[PDB]
Amino acid sequence: QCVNLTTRTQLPPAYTNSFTRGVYYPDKVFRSSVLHSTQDLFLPFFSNVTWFHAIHVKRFDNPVLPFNDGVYFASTEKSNIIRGWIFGTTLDSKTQSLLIVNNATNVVIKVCEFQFCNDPFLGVYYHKNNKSWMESEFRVYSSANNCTFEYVSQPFLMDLEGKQGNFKNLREFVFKNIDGYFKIYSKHTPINLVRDLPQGFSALEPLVDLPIGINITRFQTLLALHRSYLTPGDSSSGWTAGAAAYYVGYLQPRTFLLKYNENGTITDAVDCALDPLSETKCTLK
């Protein structure tokens, strides 16, 4: 049932600066009013992160990107366009792959031998008779066999209406595949910002730790298409993309000096080995 999407307009890849973002709690031990130094896979401060859009004005980008020692994935959204990821090596059923999807009813995580399509996507259809939106297309994979790990969350119904205005939700994720464990740290913040990553500091908390036991080197985002009568043509062209954006950066082994405040929250951090001043700060603690 998968269909390739051709009505695209190629553009160069955009780039952005990550202003002290992508910090997460290194362990599950409470610490308050302390300057704790920890070495782990962190997103370097003031690093350059790739920037991908999903707009009509039509530009939308879901390329297969590398997975180098972990990934920081930020998403600025207002209508729930980015709704999952695919991870793997070949993504062609010759090897096992991980699928995380929020299909508007459940959060499904599956380690499984998927035969992924070239342009995997979900699709929400606008209804003119009744002004209601509901998912109508699920074109992620064509087959699924030898299907090792499976988790399905409890049912829900989220607002998938296409909103007009400014981005409201910033959802930040840190993925890392260490010792056969897929660790996901997550954070969600409300914002009001147009284009770039917001400033400030927000510490991501441990969300889940999946024992997938899979080799992962590449990953791809799953965006949701808006389909409506305003867009004619077949399924390969009769569609539009809701306004959304995401940013991808790569973790490296770095030493950080995190500051836990009186309430146990990481209010700020200093990236050692960023510049000599940061090294001085880390030495002085």
Binding site: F30, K94, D179, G180, Y181, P211, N215, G264
Partner: protein, 371 residues
């Protein structure tokens, strides 16, 4: 030495011994699925090994004594004798069947076909490895060709990685094009298990229990019986297997849901979430405060005064109140009589207070005269 010259000597800080012991484990009654993990009619192949999550249960493991008998049982990162006293955070049982000669390969830092291409263990591996012969279950006459192992791979597996692919292995230089032939082998090969078979080439069932200790909330616990929680008293505690001694008091700290222990700059446990009632308790050592002994020469007398620094004497944290309790500015002096007069310093207590042995005979404490 058996003789002490005149002066003031620093002794060990004031010590309080624990009055009673307490054990606080999570409230759970179910027994862990020993029957499903060990008493399984069908184990997995080593190349595609079965990982099962164990949670919300009690790890009694004395039910296995009736029937089970394990050829190997090696625990890494924990003593076998402490397993009854601990709680385990996230527990995974990795089950498979291998050859008897390959059981040695299920261990950290090993090599061989099983350790390289089928099932790899880390060295930061807190857990246990259990192996037992199953010749009477997994072997049948004519050969049991249902258990497979990966014989060829391009590179060694990472720890706790699984590879269930069946692509043709290109041993040689020419491409295989997805068909067997010369220098093109099917990666998986089946064990031949028979009842008339050598012990080294007989089936063995292997279970690898992987867990962590004393860092996160635990839903798998030993058979230790919990006890009531007593606060504001120096006690021995066992919180989810974390033993210790100290005073437990109500805490204002707000742990996140994923946190069980709180730690300070010295990495010692300062706070703990009580597993039974979801409340935070602060842990404080019950030994605190300096103690000094003021004595004349032991030949002169065996009388001694005790200066308890940082205690107010105006239930006290003293060894014996006795009589003649005087609150100096350097602490509380017990065993010395205060005198309104002032003389030259003989035994400097501190903070302008000195002491001497005077006339019947007793130790006096006074404010030193400058001149």
């Amino acid at each position: 030495s058996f003789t002490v010259e005149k002066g003031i000597y620093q002794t060990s800080n004031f010590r309080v011994q624990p009055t009673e012991s307490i054990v606080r484990f999570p409230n759970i009654t179910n027994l862990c699925p020993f029957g499903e993990v060990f008493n399984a009619t069908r184990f997995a192949s080593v190349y595609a090994w079965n990982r099962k999550r164990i949670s919300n249960c009690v790890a009694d493991y004395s039910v296995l004594y009736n029937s089970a008998s394990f050829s190997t049982f090696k625990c890494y990162g924990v003593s076998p004798t402490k397993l009854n006293d601990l709680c385990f955070t996230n527990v995974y049982a990795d089950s498979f069947v291998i050859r008897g000669d390959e059981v040695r390969q299920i261990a950290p830092g090993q090599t061989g076909k099983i350790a390289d291409y089928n099932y790899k263990l880390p060295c930061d591996f807190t857990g246990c490895v259990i192996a037992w012969n199953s010749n009477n279950l997994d072997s049948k006459v004519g050969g049991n060709y249902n258990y497979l192992y990966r014989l060829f791979r391009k590179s060694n597996l990472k720890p706790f990685e699984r590879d269930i692919s069946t692509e043709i292995y290109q041993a040689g230089s020419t491409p295989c094009n997805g068909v067997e032939g010369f220098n093109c082998y099917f990666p998986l090969q089946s064990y031949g298990f028979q009842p008339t078979n050598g012990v080294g080439y007989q089936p063995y069932r292997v279970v690898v229990l992987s867990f962590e200790l004393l860092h996160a909330p635990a839903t798998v616990c030993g058979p230790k019986k919990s006890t009531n929680l007593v606060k504001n008293k120096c006690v021995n505690f066992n919180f989810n297997g974390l033993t210790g001694t100290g005073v437990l008091t109500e805490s204002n700290k707000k742990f996140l849901p994923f946190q069980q222990f709180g730690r300070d700059i010295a990495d010692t446990t300062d706070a703990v979430r009580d597993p039974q009632t979801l409340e935070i308790l602060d842990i404080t050592p019950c030994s605190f405060g300096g103690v000094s002994v003021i004595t004349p020469g032991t030949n002169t007398s065996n009388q001694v005064a005790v200066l308890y620094q940082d205690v107010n004497c105006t239930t006290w944290r003293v060894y014996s109140t006795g009589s003649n309790v005087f609150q100096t500015r350097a602490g509380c002096l017990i065993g010395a009589e205060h005198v309104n007069n002032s003389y030259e310093c003989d035994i400097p207590i501190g903070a302008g207070i000195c002491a001497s042995y005077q006339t019947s005979q007793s130790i006096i404490a006074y404010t030193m005269s400058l001149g």
